[PDB]
């Protein structure tokens, strides 16, 4: 009766910035998803392939829990086939994605008076991320023909930017915490199951 550590992911004190999104692997555990699906805490609960209930009756080779913070304005980018700054340069879901995207407003936790500057996102990148790719590059982005040699200036821009969450922002600009559960199924025997 080794239950999986979903509380460590959902009830964590601090969340990762989306460009450096956190991934925790879930293996050799009994998973009770009831705690999450019958929960009034979440504003977003989209499931692909699987159904949100149906869920404690299935098994999987591995479960990946990816956590980060974006603005609610961008939550709809966490979905297959989406485009935009977040989907292109921060966190990309595959087209055959089977899993659930769970999101909730976190203004009590991630907004600070005068701005919270600990949550960043990538604005500049040469090409789109592949599904489940992670880029923690900090190199100055060269927008012009002249190189930048680690110096900022015209046509040389830092590739990351702070969200700057303030509690007075509108709900569209407020911080939302996002957890993406991916259900990996392999040849190998299943290691994560519901109480079923």
């Amino acid at each position: 009766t080794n239950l999986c550590p979903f509380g460590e992911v959902f009830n964590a004190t601090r969340f990762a910035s989306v460009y450096a999104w956190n991934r925790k692997r879930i293996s050799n555990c009994v998973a009770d998803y009831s705690v999450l699906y019958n929960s009034a805490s979440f504003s977003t609960f989209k499931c692909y392939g699987v159904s949100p209930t149906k869920l404690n009756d299935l098994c999987f080779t591995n479960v990946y829990a990816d956590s980060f913070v974006i603005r609610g304005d961008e939550v709809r980018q966490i979905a297959p086939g989406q485009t935009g700054n977040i989907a292109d340069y921060n966190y990309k879901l595959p087209d055959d994605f089977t899993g659930c995207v769970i999101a909730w407003n976190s203004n009590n936790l991630d907004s600070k008076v005068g701005g919270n500057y600990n949550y960043l996102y990538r604005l500049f990148r040469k090409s789109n991320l592949k599904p489940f790719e992670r880029d923690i590059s900090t190199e100055i982005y060269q927008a012009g023909s002249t190189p930048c040699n680690g110096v900022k200036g015209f046509n040389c821009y830092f590739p990351l930017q702070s969200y700057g969450f303030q509690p007075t922002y509108g709900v569209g600009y407020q911080p939302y915490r996002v957890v993406v559960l991916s259900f990996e199924l392999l040849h190998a025997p299943a290691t994560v199951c519901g109480p079923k």
Partner: antibody, heavy 119, light 110 residues
């Protein structure tokens, strides 16, 4: 020095097609957010299209399904391919470089090219 | 679609005067508002970004302020070269949904 030069505008019959070009000099178009904005004669500015450095594109509702934005890196040129042109598309078309640092704003504009849709 | 309404539509003032143009957003856009200047037959020029940030190379007599739904562009001492049409532009959504105000035409009185 930085320059954006538009070309390819002219007379096009209703329902026809036309490809506008925007040659850039300072920045390299491949690595930049780029935008097409239009202005009907005597009226205001209307956003048309935008392309991200990764290649993802976005269009205003007035032109989706008819306009497509693209680029040539070796030519350092942005392109706007227009199909099924109507009379309401008659306008000056500007390309502009877009910076995403505080929302999206257009810090460098070309001088535009005129597109007249008439029979 | 966010609607940006500019006021007034037209305005005339004398050289050295202080001029204020207002622009109002249909919804909360925070400080994602830019101001552009367009002189006849020439390329539009960025004056202000981020509501109050003055763009590099733009004379200091141009000032931006506002937040939420109300914004103002101020010219502290009007110059003859400042005759033009001024446009506010919103960029609130993270997905491109840009909208412009209808523009204010500023002519010089002499």
């Amino acid at each position: 020095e930085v320059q954006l030069v538009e070309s390819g505008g002219g007379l096009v019959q209703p329902g026809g097609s036309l490809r506008l070009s925007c040659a850039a000099s300072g920045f390299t178009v491949g690595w930049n957010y780029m935008s097409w904005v239009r202005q009907a004669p005597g009226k205001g500015l209307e956003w048309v299209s935008v392309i991200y450095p990764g290649g993802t594109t976005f269009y205003a509702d007035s032109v989706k399904g008819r306009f497509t934005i693209s680029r040539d890196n070796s030519m350092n040129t942005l392109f706007l391919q227009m199909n099924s042109l109507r009379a309401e598309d008659t306008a000056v078309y500007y390309c502009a470089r877009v910076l995403p640092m505080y929302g999206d704003y257009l810090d460098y504009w070309g001088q535009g090219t005129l597109v007249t849709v008439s029979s | 679609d966010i609607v940006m309404t500019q006021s007034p539509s037209s305005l005339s003032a004398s050289v050295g005067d202080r001029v204020t143009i207002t622009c109002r957003a249909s919804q909360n856009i925070e400080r994602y508002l830019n101001w552009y200047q367009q002189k006849p037959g020439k390329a539009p020029k960025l004056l202000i970004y981020a509501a109050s940030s003055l763009q590099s190379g733009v004379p200091s007599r141009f000032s931006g302020s506002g937040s939420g739904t109300d914004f103002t562009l101020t010219i502290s001492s009007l110059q003859p070269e400042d005759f033009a049409t001024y446009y506010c532009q919103q960029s609130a959504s993270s997905t491109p949904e840009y909208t412009f105000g209808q523009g204010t035409k500023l002519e010089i009185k002499r």
